[PDB]
Nucleic acid binder design. Structure first.
Ligand SMILES: Nc1nc2c(ncn2[C@@H]2O[C@H](COP(=O)(O)OP(=O)(O)OP(=O)(O)O)[C@@H](O)[C@H]2O)c(=O)[nH]1
Ligand SMILES: N[C@@H](Cc1ccccc1)C(=O)O
Ligand SMILES: [Mg+2]
Ligand SMILES: [Mg+2]
Ligand SMILES: [Mg+2]
Ligand SMILES: [Mg+2]
Ligand SMILES: [Mg+2]
Ligand SMILES: [Mg+2]
Ligand SMILES: [Mg+2]
Ligand SMILES: [Mg+2]
Ligand SMILES: [Mg+2]
Ligand SMILES: [Mg+2]
Ligand SMILES: [Mg+2]
Ligand SMILES: [Mg+2]
Ligand SMILES: [Mg+2]
Ligand SMILES: [Mg+2]
Ligand SMILES: [Mg+2]
Ligand SMILES: [Mg+2]
Ligand SMILES: [Mg+2]
Ligand SMILES: [Mg+2]
Ligand SMILES: [Mg+2]
Ligand SMILES: [Mg+2]
Ligand SMILES: [Mg+2]
Ligand SMILES: [Mg+2]
Ligand SMILES: [Mg+2]
Ligand SMILES: [Mg+2]
Ligand SMILES: [Mg+2]
Ligand SMILES: [Mg+2]
Ligand SMILES: [Mg+2]
Ligand SMILES: [Mg+2]
Ligand SMILES: [Mg+2]
Ligand SMILES: [Mg+2]
Ligand SMILES: [Mg+2]
Ligand SMILES: [Mg+2]
Ligand SMILES: [Mg+2]
Ligand SMILES: [Mg+2]
Ligand SMILES: [Mg+2]
Ligand SMILES: [Mg+2]
Ligand SMILES: [Mg+2]
Ligand SMILES: [Mg+2]
Ligand SMILES: [Mg+2]
Ligand SMILES: [Mg+2]
Ligand SMILES: [Mg+2]
Ligand SMILES: [Mg+2]
Ligand SMILES: [Mg+2]
Ligand SMILES: [Mg+2]
Ligand SMILES: [Mg+2]
Ligand SMILES: [Mg+2]
Ligand SMILES: [Mg+2]
Ligand SMILES: [Mg+2]
Ligand SMILES: [Mg+2]
Ligand SMILES: [Mg+2]
Ligand SMILES: [Mg+2]
Ligand SMILES: [Mg+2]
Ligand SMILES: [Mg+2]
Ligand SMILES: [Mg+2]
Ligand SMILES: [Mg+2]
Ligand SMILES: [Mg+2]
Ligand SMILES: [Mg+2]
Ligand SMILES: [Mg+2]
Ligand SMILES: [Mg+2]
Ligand SMILES: [Mg+2]
Ligand SMILES: [Mg+2]
Ligand SMILES: [Mg+2]
Ligand SMILES: [Mg+2]
Ligand SMILES: [Mg+2]
Ligand SMILES: [Mg+2]
Ligand SMILES: [Mg+2]
Ligand SMILES: [Mg+2]
Ligand SMILES: [Mg+2]
Ligand SMILES: [Mg+2]
Ligand SMILES: [Mg+2]
Ligand SMILES: [Mg+2]
Ligand SMILES: [Mg+2]
Ligand SMILES: [Mg+2]
Ligand SMILES: [Mg+2]
Ligand SMILES: [Mg+2]
Ligand SMILES: [Mg+2]
Ligand SMILES: [Mg+2]
Ligand SMILES: [Mg+2]
Ligand SMILES: [Mg+2]
Ligand SMILES: [Mg+2]
Ligand SMILES: [Mg+2]
Ligand SMILES: [Mg+2]
Ligand SMILES: [Mg+2]
Ligand SMILES: [Mg+2]
Ligand SMILES: [Mg+2]
Ligand SMILES: [Mg+2]
Ligand SMILES: [Mg+2]
Ligand SMILES: [Mg+2]
Ligand SMILES: [Mg+2]
Ligand SMILES: [Mg+2]
Ligand SMILES: [Mg+2]
Ligand SMILES: [Mg+2]
Lengths: 60, 205, 82, 85, 393
RNA sequence: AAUUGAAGAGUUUGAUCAUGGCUCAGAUUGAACGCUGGCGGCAGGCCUAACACAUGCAAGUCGAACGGUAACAGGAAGAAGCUUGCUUCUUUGCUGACGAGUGGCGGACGGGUGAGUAAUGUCUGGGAAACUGCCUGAUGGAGGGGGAUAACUACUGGAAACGGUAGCUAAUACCGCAUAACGUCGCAAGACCAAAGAGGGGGACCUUCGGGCCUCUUGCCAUCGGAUGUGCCCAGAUGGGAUUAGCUAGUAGGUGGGGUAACGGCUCACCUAGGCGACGAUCCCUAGCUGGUCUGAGAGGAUGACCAGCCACACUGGAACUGAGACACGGUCCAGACUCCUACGGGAGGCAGCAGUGGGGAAUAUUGCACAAUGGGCGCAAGCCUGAUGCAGCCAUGCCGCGUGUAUGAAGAAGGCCUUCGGGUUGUAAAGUACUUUCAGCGGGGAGGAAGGGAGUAAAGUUAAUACCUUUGCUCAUUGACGUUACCCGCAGAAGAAGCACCGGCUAACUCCGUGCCAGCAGCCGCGGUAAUACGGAGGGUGCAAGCGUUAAUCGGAAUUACUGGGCGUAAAGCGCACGCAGGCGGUUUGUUAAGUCAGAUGUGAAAUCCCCGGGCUCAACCUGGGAACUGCAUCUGAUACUGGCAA
RNA sequence: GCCCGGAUAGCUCAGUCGGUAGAGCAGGGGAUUGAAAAUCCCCGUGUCCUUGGUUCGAUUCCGAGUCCGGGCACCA
C-alpha cells in the first residue's frame, strides 16, 4: 500500500518499521492510508504545541 | 467531577443569574454582567436551532453542577418514567442532596453546599451521606451533626435564607440547624424562567 | 443423583444462594429441573431474608433426592411448629 | 502416564483376559447348536441347546452379557429349532 | 535453578587479564579442577567455559564466560574476558565488575602490546588490586631466563601506578596442573592463598538505593527475559518494583527472581554478580547498556558538565588538539556511547595533558549522577578519564 | 404494576426542481492507537497460529474389602543393664495409624477450545422399538465350596522403564454346586438364571475359651417402581453460488440369516430397479448452533466475546478394550510427525486444564493464597482432594460514584493580548483575611459473612438391659483464605490531587503574527498564488472532562434491495415479437367441506438477558424478589363469511 | 556478544587506485501575470553518512562510530 505521511518533516527513509491507520487523503489519487506518528520508528514532529495526539508529541 | 474555574464567567455567557457567586452578598453588579462572555463580548450571536437548544441545556447543567455523562443518564431515567418528560428532568435535578442542602440555607452558595455534603457534615434519617448525587426520595429529615453544627460557615449562611424565596415543599427549624424534606418538588413552585422544552428536543434525536 | 442444593449467585463479597434441585454431576450454576426459593446470609433483623417452599421438598425427597449440609439447616430453621 | 491411578490399566488388562475367555466360551456353545442346525434332528440341537441355556443366563446375570442379548439368543435360536426340526 | 544459595563467606568478584593465546581459559580451567578435588568444590572442565562454533573453529575467547569456585575462607566468582583487539568493548564489562584481578604474563614471550593496554584500561575503570601469573614456565628449562621475565613485569606495574615489587608473581603451568601433577597442582593451590592474603575483603554499599547496570541480556525458554550484572549498590528483594532506565526510554517492571550461577536468592545484595528475571518484557526492547534502578531515584540524561582529564603521550592518549565537533566513545558503567563535545567560553582549543570542564551531548540517553566516572576511547586506544560535575539534560 | 413512539444537513448547477450516489450528526465494541492520568465500587480481560512447549500444579479415596502388627508411633506379657523403674528390649490388631501392590467405587463429571460439521449437527414440536451406576419406593432372598493371585521370600534380566522362574497366603476381585419366582423362553407343559459380608455393643445360655448367640448400623443379589439420564426416529425451521444440472450401486425397496441395550442396508444373502432432484439433489466456498447480544419506532439488519443449554474435538490418523454409561483432555494398543533421555539394547511424553514461555500480532494478565463458605469425588465420621470455585495482584478495558477546596475579596493590582492608545480584555481570575478535613497519611475500637463439627450432660427412642447405638435439648472449649477487612473515632494541616480535542459551512467558538498553490490541513464541500476565521504559532473562546480524541467494526439515518415502504415514456430500468409446459392467478349459483382462516382450550415457549414495579450495596453501575413477557409451537373442540378441494 | 555489506548536492547518478568534487533533471532571482506555465535573461543551490589519524594537501589512504541491511551464535 501507499501511506500519506502527515505533519511538517519526517523520519522515514527506505525501510523503517511504521504503524498504519485508515484514512483517505482526498488529494493524491490512490493513497488510502495514513502513517501514524509517534508509533514505533516514525517519531513525532518537532515543536507542535496545538493538536499533539495527532502527530505524537509530548508536553513542553 | 466539577467545573473548578472562573464561576462568574459562566453567568455572562448565558446572561441570567445562575446563583454561582451569590454568597453573603446579595447582588453582584461587579463583573460587567450580560454583555461580556469572553474577549469578543461586543459581538452579538445569530444563534441557530442547535444553539438555542444547546445554550438551554448548558445553562441547566451549570446551575445544578452536573456533567454531560451524568446528565445524559438523568435524561434516560426521565424517558422511562411516566408523565411529562420535561417536568421529570427538573424533579430529578432538584432531588439531589447538594441542591436540597442549598435550598435549606445550610450553605451560602451551591459549591459550598456540595462540599458541605461531601465532608461528612450532612446527615439524613440518621445516616451520614457524602454523595452530591444522592437521590432524595420524599418524606426525609436532613440534618447537621453536632461536630459541624454551630461552626463559622453555617450561621452566617443561614441568615441569607431569610432573604431567599424559601420553597414551599420543604421546612427548616433554624434552632438546632435541623431540616425536614416534606414532599417532592412541583414544576409550578420553583424555576418560573428556565425552559424545559428545548432540552427534551436536543436529546430525542 | 438429584440433590437440593445452593447455586451461589450474586456479586463479589455479597453472595445470594439460589436453592435449587439439580443433578449432582451437573455444575454449581448448571442445569436444574426447577428452583425452590433462596437463601441470603446478609439480611439482618428486617422484613425478608430466606425462603423455602415446603411442598416441593416433600415431592423431591419423597421421590428420592439428597439434601445438602446447608439446606438441611434451613429445613430445621423454618421448623414444624416452633 | 504421570498418575498413580494407572491401576485401572493393569486391572482392565487382567479383566479382559478373564472376560474374553468366558466371552469366547459362550459363543462356541452357541456355534455348537448351529452345527446341529442345517441337517439335524430335534435332539442333537436340543442337547446342545440345553447345555448353552444355563451358561448364557449365568453370563447374563454377571453383567458381561446384557440379559436382552441372552433373551434374543434363546428366542431367535429356539425359532430355528422349533420351526425346522 | 533449584538449590538456594546460602550466604556463607564473603563474595569476591575476580577476573583474569592477559594477551591473546597467552594463558587465560587454561588458567581458569586449572583453577576449577584443582579447587574441586582438594577443598571439595564443584568439578566442571575446560570445555564448559568456552563454547559455540565461533570459539572453536579459531579457538579464541570472544564472550565473557564466568565461573563460580569456592575456598575455605572466601567464595569467588571468576570472569574470562576475550583479551583480543577486536572485542575490547565486552572486555570492559567483565573488567568493570572485577575487584581483584589475575594478570597473565608468559615466561616464553614476556610482556606484549595488549598486556599494557589491559592494565591501562583497568585503573581508569576500577581495579584496585592485581596479581600476576607466569603461565608457561616448563617450556623453558632454565633458571636464569625465566627470572629475567619477572623483572620486566614489575616495570609495567610500577611505571603505570601500582605497588609493583609488592605484587605476588606466582609461577607455574596450567596444562600440567590441569591433568594432575602433584608438584604443579600444589603451585596453583599457592595462588589460591595469594588471592586470600593479598586482596582484602571489598567494602560493599548496603545502604544507598538500588542500582544494577546490565552487562549482557538472556532469554530463558520458559521464564522470560533475564538480565545479568553486578549489583553496584543497595539491595534487591523478590517482589519489589524496578524501573528500567537507560537507552531508548524508561520502563516499569517487577523482580520475579534473583539467582547466583543457577541457584535461588531472596536478598541479592551489593557486590555479587546476579541474574534478575523481569515481568513481561521481551528480548528485543531491553538492550545491553540500560540500568535497573528503584522507582524515583535516578533519571535519564543526554547532556552533562564534567571535569575531564585528557591524557598525553606520557600516560597514554592523544598528541594533537581538537575543536568542537569531536565525537569519541564514552564508557560509563558497561557500554559505549558517542557524544559531541561543546567547550566553554574563552577556550579556543583543547591541548593534550590538560584539566578542563566540558559539556558533552550524547546521542542516546544514559542514567547518571554527580560523582560517577568514565573512560573515553577512540581509534582502538584510550583518550582520558573524568568525573561528572552537574546534570543538565 | 407490566411499552409514552419515526427529525435531518452538506454535496452535481450561473441558478431551479428532480433523479442519484458520496459524506456527517446518534448508539454500541472483547477493541486498538496517540496524548494524558487521583481513588473506590461491579464487570470483564489471545478475536491472530486448533502454531510450538521448559518448569511446577489441575483426581483421587476409604483399615466400615482381608490378610499382613511388611514401614512409622504408642501401649501391654516379659527382658537386660544398673542412677530397681531410670534405661536396653523380644513378642503383641488391643488402639493410633498406614504401604511399591490386590480389591470397591470414582476418573466419562467438573474444567478448556471452536479445528471440523451446511445436517449425522442445532432449534421448536411430536414419536416407539430402548437401556439407566450411585440416589431411592416396594417384595423376597443374602446357600455352600473351589482354585488361583499380586503383595511376600528365593534365585535371577536390565542403565532405566521394567521383568522372569519356583514356592507360600487372604478377601466385598474370580468361578461352579443347591436355591428360586409376577425374572427369561415357549402356543402351552417345562427348561433356565443370583449373591458378600463387614461395623459397635452385650443378659441369659454356650465356650474345643476360635467364639457361638442376640441386636443395631451399614453393607449385599432377584424383580415391578420412581426420578434423573442417555440412545434412536419423523416433521418443519436452520448461510452464500446455477459462471455447480443431473446425482446415486448397498445405491432404493423386499424376503431370509446375522448383529445392536434397542428399530433400521447397521450388515451379508438372493429378489426388485427403484430413490433423490427447478418447493435446488450433487458439487464448490464459508460457518459450531441456540437462549440471547447490538441496532431499529417497529418490521427487520447485523451478530453469537462474557453468563447459560446442545453438539463436536483433545499432538495427526486409526482401532477397539474396561465399564450402567467412552470407542475415553491429564487411560490402553498401533502407525505417523516432533521434541527429550540412553550404558545405542531400547524407553519416555502430549498446556484447545492454571500460571508462564517463545512465536504470530494492531492488540489481552500472576509460574499468588485458601479449602473458612458454595457444590464435586470417595469416605460410618475425623477429615483428605480440587488452578471447579472463592479471593488477591495486574490492565482507565468498560459501566458508575466522589474528589482536585469553600465564602468574602477593586488597587478592577501586576504580567499577557488587542487598540480609535480614550481604553478594552485575560478577570473576583490571582494575592490576602475568615473557615472545612470526603478520599489519600497515621494510630486505636470493630461488626457481617460460620452453617456446623468436638467433649460432656439429662430426657426420649432402642433393647433382656439404667451399656453401645439413634434423636433432642443443654454447658464448655473452639473453627476465617479474604484481613493492616466493611464500618466508626480521633490526629495534623490548602496541605497530596486536570487534561485534549476542536474554533470557514454542515456544528457550539474570534482576532493577531509567521508562511506566500510553498510548507501544510481534511469527514464531505474545499482552504494556501503577499491583509488566510480552513495552513504553523500566539492570546482568547467552545465542547467534552479522568477521560479525550484518532482508527476499525455493526446497525442507524438509507423509503440508497422499498413485506410494512421505491420504481421501469425521456434520469439506471419494458425481453425485438409471438406460441406455450411447469409455476402464479382466476367469472358466477347452490350444496357439503374442515386444509387455509379465524375463535377458544390445553400443555409446552429452560434459567439468566429485555421491559414494569419493588428490595439491597451510603448513591449508582451491580446485585436481586415478584409479575408480565417468552410476538411462538403442537394437539384438541368449534365458527364457517372469504381462500381451496369434490359437487349440482 | 561478533562477522560482513550499504551511504556522493532537493531527487537519479558519473567520479577514485592523492592535487581543492561533476552530469541530467529539479529549484532560486529578474521582466511579463492577480499567481503560475511556456517565452527571455542569470545562478550549483555540496557538513562527499559523522568524526579523528598517516600526509604540505584526503570523497578517493587507515581507524572509530551512526542508523539500516543481511548472517551466526549464548541460553540465570
Ligand atoms: N605448554 C603450555 N601451554 C599453555 C600454557 N598456558 C596456555 N597454554 C596454551 O595456550 C592455549 C590457551 O590459550 P588461551 O590463553 O586460552 O587463549 P585466549 O582465551 O584467546 O586468551 P585471552 O586472549 O587471554 O582470552 C592452549 O591451547 C595451550 O596449549 C602453559 O602453561 N603451558
Ligand atoms: N550472574 C551470571 C554471570 C554470567 C554472565 C554471563 C554468562 C555466564 C554467567 C551467573 O550465571
Ligand atoms: Mg465520570
Ligand atoms: Mg461457577
Ligand atoms: Mg451430596
Ligand atoms: Mg495406585
Ligand atoms: Mg480383548
Ligand atoms: Mg474358539
Ligand atoms: Mg478365536
Ligand atoms: Mg466361534
Ligand atoms: Mg466387574
Ligand atoms: Mg580465554
Ligand atoms: Mg590462535
Ligand atoms: Mg446536489
Ligand atoms: Mg458550484
Ligand atoms: Mg510438560
Ligand atoms: Mg495440588
Ligand atoms: Mg498434590
Ligand atoms: Mg494416593
Ligand atoms: Mg491414601
Ligand atoms: Mg465388584
Ligand atoms: Mg462436557
Ligand atoms: Mg476459566
Ligand atoms: Mg483461554
Ligand atoms: Mg474463556
Ligand atoms: Mg420401554
Ligand atoms: Mg458399578
Ligand atoms: Mg463361602
Ligand atoms: Mg471363601
Ligand atoms: Mg470343585
Ligand atoms: Mg490343587
Ligand atoms: Mg490345595
Ligand atoms: Mg511348574
Ligand atoms: Mg491354601
Ligand atoms: Mg463378586
Ligand atoms: Mg416374560
Ligand atoms: Mg411368556
Ligand atoms: Mg399360560
Ligand atoms: Mg407360564
Ligand atoms: Mg457366594
Ligand atoms: Mg457405605
Ligand atoms: Mg444398605
Ligand atoms: Mg445395592
Ligand atoms: Mg420412480
Ligand atoms: Mg427505520
Ligand atoms: Mg475465548
Ligand atoms: Mg442428538
Ligand atoms: Mg484417539
Ligand atoms: Mg462392556
Ligand atoms: Mg466423546
Ligand atoms: Mg493434558
Ligand atoms: Mg482421562
Ligand atoms: Mg487395549
Ligand atoms: Mg493456559
Ligand atoms: Mg508471552
Ligand atoms: Mg485440607
Ligand atoms: Mg460417598
Ligand atoms: Mg458418606
Ligand atoms: Mg479417627
Ligand atoms: Mg492433586
Ligand atoms: Mg494451590
Ligand atoms: Mg458447611
Ligand atoms: Mg486542524
Ligand atoms: Mg497574514
Ligand atoms: Mg486550525
Ligand atoms: Mg433500510
Ligand atoms: Mg428510486
Ligand atoms: Mg416515481
Ligand atoms: Mg440518455
Ligand atoms: Mg434510459
Ligand atoms: Mg416493446
Ligand atoms: Mg429476460
Ligand atoms: Mg411478447
Ligand atoms: Mg400469450
Ligand atoms: Mg401454464
Ligand atoms: Mg389453483
Ligand atoms: Mg371465485
Ligand atoms: Mg364437520
Ligand atoms: Mg389460534
Ligand atoms: Mg425442552
Ligand atoms: Mg426466560
Ligand atoms: Mg433493567
Ligand atoms: Mg428480575
Ligand atoms: Mg425472578
Ligand atoms: Mg415464582
Ligand atoms: Mg404454525
Ligand atoms: Mg398448529
Ligand atoms: Mg358438535
Ligand atoms: Mg357446516
Ligand atoms: Mg368454495
Ligand atoms: Mg507584476
Ligand atoms: Mg497582488
Ligand atoms: Mg514546471
Ligand atoms: Mg518553474
Amino acid at each position: 500500500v501507499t501511506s500519506y505521511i502527515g505533519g511538517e518533516g519526517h523520519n522515514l527513509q527506505e525501510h523503517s518499521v511504521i504503524l498504519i491507520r485508515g484514512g483517505r487523503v482526498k488529494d493524491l489519487p490512490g493513497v488510502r492510508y495514513h502513517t501514524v506518528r509517534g508509533a514505533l520508528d516514525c517519531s513525532g514532529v518537532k515543536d507542535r504545541k496545538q493538536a499533539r495526539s495527532k502527530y505524537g508529541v509530548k508536553r513542553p | 467531577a466539577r467545573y473548578l474555574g472562573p464561576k462568574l464567567k459562566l453567568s455572562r455567557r448565558e446572561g441570567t443569574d445562575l446563583f454561582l457567586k451569590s454568597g453573603v452578598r446579595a447582588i453582584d453588579t461587579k463583573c460587567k454582567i450580560e454583555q461580556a462572555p469572553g474577549q469578543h463580548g461586543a459581538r452579538k450571536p445569530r444563534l441557530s436551532d442547535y444553539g438555542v437548544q444547546l445554550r438551554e441545556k448548558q445553562k441547566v447543567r451549570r446551575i445544578y453542577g452536573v456533567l454531560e455523562r451524568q446528565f445524559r443518564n438523568y435524561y434516560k431515567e426521565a424517558a422511562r418514567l411516566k408523565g411529562n418528560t420535561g417536568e421529570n428532568l427538573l424533579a430529578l435535578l432538584e432531588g439531589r442532596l447538594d441542591n436540597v442542602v442549598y435550598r435549606m440555607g445550610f450553605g451560602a452558595t451551591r459549591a459550598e453546599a456540595r462540599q458541605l455534603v461531601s465532608h461528612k457534615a450532612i446527615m439524613v434519617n440518621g445516616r451520614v451521606v457524602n454523595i452530591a448525587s444522592y437521590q432524595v426520595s420524599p418524606n426525609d429529615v436532613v440534618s447537621i451533626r453536632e461536630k459541624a453544627k454551630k461552626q463559622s460557615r453555617v450561621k452566617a449562611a443561614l441568615e441569607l435564607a431569610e432573604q431567599r424565596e424559601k420553597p414551599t415543599w420543604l421546612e427548616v427549624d433554624a434552632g438546632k440547624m435541623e431540616g425536614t424534606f416534606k414532599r417532592k418538588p412541583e414544576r409550578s413552585d420553583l424555576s418560573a424562567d428556565i425552559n424545559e422544552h428545548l432540552i427534551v428536543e436536543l436529546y430525542s434525536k | 443423583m438429584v440433590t437440593i442444593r445452593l447455586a451461589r449467585h450474586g456479586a463479589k463479597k455479597r453472595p445470594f444462594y439460589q436453592v435449587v434441585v439439580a443433578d449432582s454431576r451437573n455444575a454449581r450454576n448448571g442445569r436444574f429441573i426447577e428452583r425452590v426459593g433462596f437463601f441470603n446470609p446478609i439480611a439482618s433483623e428486617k422484613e425478608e431474608g430466606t425462603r423455602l417452599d415446603l411442598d416441593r421438598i416433600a415431592h423431591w425427597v419423597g421421590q428420592g433426592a439428597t439434601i445438602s449440609d446447608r439446606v438441611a439447616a434451613l429445613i430445621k430453621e423454618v421448623n414444624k411448629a416452633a | 502416564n504421570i498418575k498413580s491411578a494407572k491401576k485401572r490399566a493393569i486391572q482392565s488388562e487382567k479383566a479382559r483376559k478373564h472376560n474374553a475367555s468366558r466371552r469366547s466360551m459362550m459363543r462356541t456353545f452357541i456355534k455348537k447348536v448351529y452345527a446341529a442346525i442345517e441337517a439335524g434332528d430335534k435332539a442333537a440341537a436340543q442337547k446342545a441347546f440345553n447345555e448353552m441355556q444355563p451358561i448364557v443366563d449365568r453370563q447374563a446375570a454377571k453383567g458381561l452379557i446384557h440379559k436382552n442379548k441372552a433373551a434374543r439368543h434363546k428366542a431367535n435360536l429356539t425359532a430355528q429349532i422349533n420351526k425346522l426340526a | 535453578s533449584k538449590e538456594k544459595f546460602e550466604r556463607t563467606k564473603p563474595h569476591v568478584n575476580v577476573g583474569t587479564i592477559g594477551h591473546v593465546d597467552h594463558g587465560k581459559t587454561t588458567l581458569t580451567a586449572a583453577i576449577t579442577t584443582v579447587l574441586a578435588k582438594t577443598y571439595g568444590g564443584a568439578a566442571r572442565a575446560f570445555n564448559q567455559i568456552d563454547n559455540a562454533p565461533e570459539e572453536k573453529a579459531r579457538g579464541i575467547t570472544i564472550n565473557t564466560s564466568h565461573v563460580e569456585y569456592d575456598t575455605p575462607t572466601r567464595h569467588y566468582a571468576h570472569v574470562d574476558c576475550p583479551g583480543a583487539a577486536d572485542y575490547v568493548k565486552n572486555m570492559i564489562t567483565g573488567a568493570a565488575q572485577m575487584d581483584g584481578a589475575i594478570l597473565v604474563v608468559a615466561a616464553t614471550d614476556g610482556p606484549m602490546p595488549q598486556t599494557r593496554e589491559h592494565i591501562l584500561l583497568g585503573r581508569q575503570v576500577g581495579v584496585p588490586y592485581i596479581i600476576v601469573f607466569l603461565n608457561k614456565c616448563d617450556m623453558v628449562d632454565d633458571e636464569e631466563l625465566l627470572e629475567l621475565v619477572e623483572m620486566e613485569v614489575r616495570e609495567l606495574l610500577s611505571q603505570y601506578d601500582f605497588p609493583g615489587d609488592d605484587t605476588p608473581i606466582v609461577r607455574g603451568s596450567a596444562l600440567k596442573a590441569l591433568e594432575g601433577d602433584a608438584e604443579w597442582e600444589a603451585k596453583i593451590l599457592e595462588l589460591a592463598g595469594f588471592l586470600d592474603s593479598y586482596i582484602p575483603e571489598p567494602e560493599r554499599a548496603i545502604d544507598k538505593p538500588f542500582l544494577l547496570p546490565i552487562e549482557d541480556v538472556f532469554s530463558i525458554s520458559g521464564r522470560g527475559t533475564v538480565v545479568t550484572g553486578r549489583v553496584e549498590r543497595g539491595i534487591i528483594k523478590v517482589g519489589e518494583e524496578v524501573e528500567i532506565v537507560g537507552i531508548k526510554e524508561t520502563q516499569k517492571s517487577t523482580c520475579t527472581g534473583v539467582e547466583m550461577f543457577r541457584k535461588l536468592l531472596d536478598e541479592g545484595r551489593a557486590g555479587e554478580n546476579v541474574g534478575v528475571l523481569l515481568r513481561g518484557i521481551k528480548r528485543e526492547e531491553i538492550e545491553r547498556g540500560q540500568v535497573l534502578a528503584k522507582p524515583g531515584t535516578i533519571k535519564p540524561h543526554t547532556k552533562f558538565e564534567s571535569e575531564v582529564y585528557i591524557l598525553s603521550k606520557d600516560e597514554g592518549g592523544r598528541h594533537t588538539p581538537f575543536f568542537k565537533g569531536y565525537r569519541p566513545q564514552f564508557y560509563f558503567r558497561t557500554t559505549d556511547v558517542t557524544g559531541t563535545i561543546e567547550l566553554p567560553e574563552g577556550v579556543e582549543m583543547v591541548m593534550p595533558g590538560d584539566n578542563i570542564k566540558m559539556v558533552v551531548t550524547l546521542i542516546h540517553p544514559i542514567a547518571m549522577d554527580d560523582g560517577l566516572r568514565f573512560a573515553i576511547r577512540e581509534g582502538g586506544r584510550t583518550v582520558g578519564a573524568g568525573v561528572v560535575a552537574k546534570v543538565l539534560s
